[PDB]
Nucleic acid binder design. Structure first.
Ligand SMILES: [Mg+2]
Ligand SMILES: [Mg+2]
Ligand SMILES: [Mg+2]
Ligand SMILES: [Mg+2]
Ligand SMILES: [Mg+2]
Ligand SMILES: [Mg+2]
Ligand SMILES: [Mg+2]
Ligand SMILES: [Mg+2]
Ligand SMILES: [Mg+2]
Ligand SMILES: [Zn+2]
Lengths: 45, 107, 97, 122, 95, 136, 23, 85, 116
RNA sequence: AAAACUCCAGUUGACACAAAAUAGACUACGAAAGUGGCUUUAACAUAUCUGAACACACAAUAGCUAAGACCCAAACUGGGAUUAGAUACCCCACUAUGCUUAGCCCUAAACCUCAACAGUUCAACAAAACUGCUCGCCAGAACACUACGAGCCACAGCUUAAAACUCAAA
């Protein structure tokens, strides 16, 4: 069952052909890893 | 000295290695992973070559081959790092224990 | 005849359980200028401070309702082979009767 | 095993940034890497001033990439990134989620130790 | 006989305390969370007694802080003035 | 409501001084030591405005490292600053010393307005090896 | 505890060093 | 140096309360544990007697915390003797 | 709040090395350290400073130094009366902190025991 | 206080083979010595115990050999103060050296002075008393971390280690 996840993800993995579009899509998009937490333990962004 | 392209120890019983992509086969090849998987493959090879009952780690011969593979690992580490005295001591003690258990098995 | 095990199993304390944050009614037996000692249940009496509000209405036999934290205040310190005690119990009141 | 390159470039425009990125991933593939994904953290003014190979930089562009490669490729790419001029910094690291978190049962209360000094009058 | 006690576990046992993030995950990129656990004026990170979390998480976050500082995600002297406007967890007294 | 932290060049700073923004305010730098203290005033763009010290005021070996001399130097520097047309000042203090606290009060008695105080004292993270321990 | 014996040893070692320096 | 100026270890004066500002600065520096570090870096501290001093400080903190626990736990009892006889 | 001391000392059952090496035995005693002075009195520094200022301004002219000289006298007087007031304050008892002698009385009423 | 520097001092901008605050009130790893900046790699023995001072391998700091490195500190040295004198504690400058390489030396209060292994609940002080097995060591003080002998890349060294005379103590 574990093999199945990274199996289908190969198509998600970029290549020499998908690069010329994934690079642009990623640099146009934005991503953030930051997130805080309160006294109880509830996440807040 | 097993080949690099040989997939990991765990991913052998699965029958999906034939239809799976060559990129996945390369990813699962032990050359990507550390030397631990290489020595695992070596241990399995020795167990299948010599031992009558495989996957029996409690056996003296299994312990001996494990220590021999570890000895080769330490020897390579030392020829790449002539100065690692900790690994030097470990190699010496490993060969001593190997001689000890060889005597016991001979008895 | 009644067995002591049965009296324990039906006792008020076995059903009381932990004393932390549990209401209970009690009365006083001795009182000082600024404080009063309530006998409520179990072994020890709990000390308390007279509130400026309703301070006049505190005399012998007064039934006051209050919570509590423990039944005996103790603590084991660094060189304490056995825990030391205070011979009291912390209890705070928020109403009477 | 998995490897994340956290990289910070100097502030410049999309065409040359894309050129740098494609050249870098080409170097990855040359070393034999397999790229998992690319993530743009965004453009930010780096916290403290630094000194590049020949100048100083008060801003930067944060990128990250996740890939798979053997070991030698690691230091080969490190020296590649050091030789590259327009790249401010780049660091290879392992992946955190690859190391499964040990199951936690919470904080245990530590009782005060005793019997350190034997009983006597002193 | 039946009224006698029996060998039995403690049901009154309250669940073991878990820190703010005993189960959650942390990485050197969550600069917001990593700067939540540091003094804003000096920039030096607080200890366990001030923070209120387990040693494993403390070690993880301090190592991540060092990594971020050295690579460039974080400064060392001054806490980021953009992330201090966040919930205050670590107890203090000077204010 | 008051913010103890200082403003940032990035907006927004809702507090000015003499109708001026925080950054362009002149900055005073003082270096404290067990033996002596040195004071100086500079513009926001590093133009050296004023400079004085206990030595220039005429304090000798033992007496340079005192608070009275520090506050006198502060008085002098404040006089020079107001002569040159300086009212407000951002304080910067560097290191320990007797006259550390005294120089600021000297400036105040001179008649300047301190807005903030930053202690940019040297802190090595195990960088160099200091002197050996002397036996008093 | 007392260190008189090791002071004796100290003096002996010092004198021996001086002796070898002379000879 | 490379870091920005006038952010860290600063205090904004209000109503010209320079004494309060400086006192708060010293207080925060001590709670962060700095001035001790400056006076330790002034003259060199050998590793051995450094470790000795630090172990002594740890033990002192432990003893003081235990005595403070006892004090805070028994100060409630310090009251007028209710039972004379 | 207190840090634990499981295996920090040199005990026979502890395999590893010791963390601590306390010179004196680590036991809570029934005697508390009595307080101590903080520093030596100093005051009127700014007063005498402005006094010397107006002195060197007016060549030792009392009718001109009046302000500085009176302020200095008043500050010294206030310092003396404050010393007396805080002395009687320490004698009658410091508020907010408990006194050593009565703390010791309480501790001997509720003493620690290392022994049984 | 003196001597010393003013090619001095302060802000600002650029810069290291140097040592790695805070975390750390944490007690983890390594057989031990030791190890607490960051990253990667390799890797952290033995699933009965003991066990070589006839061997093997490590072994802090210091020191030696030949190249290099120069922020800082500093033996030695020189100068200035103190002192009756100061070949020292105080102050200033610099060097071996502390650092990186390829070797050597193999010593410590190398002590937590408490041996490994499997277990249990009283001399004094110290860190409570003990059981079973095993190795090593000890037998009045001092002469003695000594002489002689033997081995060592060591040559003012290291390891092993007595003897003669003296005393009633130590
Ligand atoms: Mg001692
Ligand atoms: Mg520390
Ligand atoms: Mg050397
Ligand atoms: Mg040198
Ligand atoms: Mg040691
Ligand atoms: Mg020994
Ligand atoms: Mg043994
Ligand atoms: Mg010797
Ligand atoms: Mg010899
Ligand atoms: Zn936790």
């Amino acid at each position: 069952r574990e093999v199945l996840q990274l199996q289908e993800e190969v198509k998600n993995f970029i290549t020499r052909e998908n690069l010329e579009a994934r690079v642009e899509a990623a640099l146009d998009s934005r991503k953030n890893y930051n997130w805080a937490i309160t006294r109880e333990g509830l996440v807040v962004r | 000295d097993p080949p690099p392209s040989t997939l990991l120890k765990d991913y052998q019983n699965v029958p999906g290695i034939e239809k799976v992509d060559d990129v996945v086969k390369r990813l699962l090849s032990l050359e990507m992973a550390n030397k631990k998987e290489m020595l695992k493959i070596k241990q399995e090879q020795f167990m299948k070559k010599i031992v009558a009952n495989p996957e029996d780690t409690r056996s003296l011969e299994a312990r001996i081959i494990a220590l021999s593979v570890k000895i080769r690992s330490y020897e390579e580490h030392l020829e790449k790092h002539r100065k690692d005295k900790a690994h030097k001591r470990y190699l010496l003690m490993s060969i001593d224990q190997r001689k000890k258990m060889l005597k016991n098995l001979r008895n | 005849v009644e067995s002591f095990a049965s009296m324990l199993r039906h006792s008020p304390l076995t059903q009381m359980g932990p004393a932390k944050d549990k209401l209970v009614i009690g009365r006083i037996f001795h009182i000082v200028e600024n404080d009063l000692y309530i006998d409520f249940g179990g072994k020890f009496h709990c000390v308390c401070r007279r509130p400026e509000v309703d301070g006049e209405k505190y005399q012998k036999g007064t039934r006051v309702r209050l919570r509590l934290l423990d039944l005996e205040l103790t603590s084991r310190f660094l060189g304490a082979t056995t825990d030391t005690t205070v011979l009291e119990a912390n209890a705070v009141l928020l109403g009477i009767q | 095993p998995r490897y994340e390159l956290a990289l910070i470039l100097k502030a410049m425009q999309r065409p040359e940034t894309a050129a740098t990125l494609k050249r870098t991933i080409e170097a990855l593939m040359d070393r034999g890497a397999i790229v998992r994904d690319l993530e743009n953290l965004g453009e930010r003014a780096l916290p403290y001033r630094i000194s590049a190979h020949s100048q100083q930089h008060n801003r930067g562009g944060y990128f990250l990439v996740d890939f798979y490669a053997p070991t030698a490729a690691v230091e080969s790419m490190v020296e590649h990134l050091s030789r590259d001029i327009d790249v401010i910094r780049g660091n290879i690291v392992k992946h955190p989620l690859t190391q499964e978190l040990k199951e936690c049962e919470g904080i245990v209360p530590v009782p005060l130790a005793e019997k350190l000094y034997s009983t006597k009058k002193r | 006989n039946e009224d006698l006690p029996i060998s039995m576990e403690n049901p009154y046992k309250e669940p073991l305390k878990k820190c703010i993030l005993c189960g959650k995950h942390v990485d050197y990129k969550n600069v917001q969370l990593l700067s939540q656990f540091v003094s804003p004026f000096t920039g030096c990170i607080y200890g366990r007694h001030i923070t209120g979390l387990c040693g494993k998480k403390q070690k993880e976050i301090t190592k991540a802080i060092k990594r971020a500082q050295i690579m460039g995600f974080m400064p060392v002297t001054y806490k980021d003035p953009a992330y201090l406007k966040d919930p205050k967890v670590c107890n203090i007294r000077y204010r | 409501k008051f913010s103890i932290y200082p403003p940032i060049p990035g907006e927004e700073s809702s507090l000015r001084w003499a109708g001026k923004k925080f950054e362009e305010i002149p900055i005073a730098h003082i270096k404290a030591s067990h033996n002596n203290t040195q004071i100086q005033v500079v513009s926001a763009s590093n133009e050296p405005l004023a400079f004085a010290s206990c030595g220039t005021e005429g304090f000798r070996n033992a007496k340079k490292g005192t608070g009275i001399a520090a506050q006198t130097a502060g008085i002098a520097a404040a006089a020079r600053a107001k002569q040159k047309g300086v009212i407000h000042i951002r304080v910067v203090v560097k290191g320990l010393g007797p006259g550390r606290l005294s120089a600021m009060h000297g400036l105040i008695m001179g008649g300047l307005e301190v807005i903030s105080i930053t202690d940019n004292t040297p802190i090595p993270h195990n960088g160099c090896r200091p002197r050996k321990a002397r036996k008093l | 505890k007392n260190v008189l014996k090791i002071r004796r040893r100290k003096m002996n070692h010092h004198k021996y060093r001086k002796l070898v320096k002379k000879t | 140096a490379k870091h920005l100026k006038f952010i860290a270890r600063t205090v904004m004066v209000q109503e010209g309360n320079v004494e309060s500002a400086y006192r708060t600065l010293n207080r925060i520096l001590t709670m962060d544990g700095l001035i001790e570090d400056i006076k330790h870096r002034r003259y060199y501290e050998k590793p051995c007697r450094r470790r000795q001093r630090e172990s002594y400080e740890r033990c002192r903190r432990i003893y003081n915390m235990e005595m403070a626990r006892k004090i805070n736990f028994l100060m409630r009892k310090n009251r007028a003797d209710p039972w004379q006889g | 709040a207190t840090p634990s001391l499981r295996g920090r000392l040199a005990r026979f059952g502890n395999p590893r090395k010791p963390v601590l090496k306390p010179n004196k035995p680590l036991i809570l005693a029934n005697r508390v350290g009595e307080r101590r002075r903080e520093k030596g009195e100093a005051t009127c520094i700014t007063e005498m400073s402005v006094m010397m200022a107006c002195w060197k301004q007016n060549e030792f002219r009392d009718d001109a130094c009046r302000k500085e000289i009176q302020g200095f006298l008043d500050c010294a007087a206030r310092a003396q009366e404050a010393r007396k007031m805080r002395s009687i304050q320490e004698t009658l008892g410091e508020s907010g902190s408990l006194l050593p002698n009565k703390l010791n009385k309480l501790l001997q009423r509720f003493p620690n025991k290392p022994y049984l």
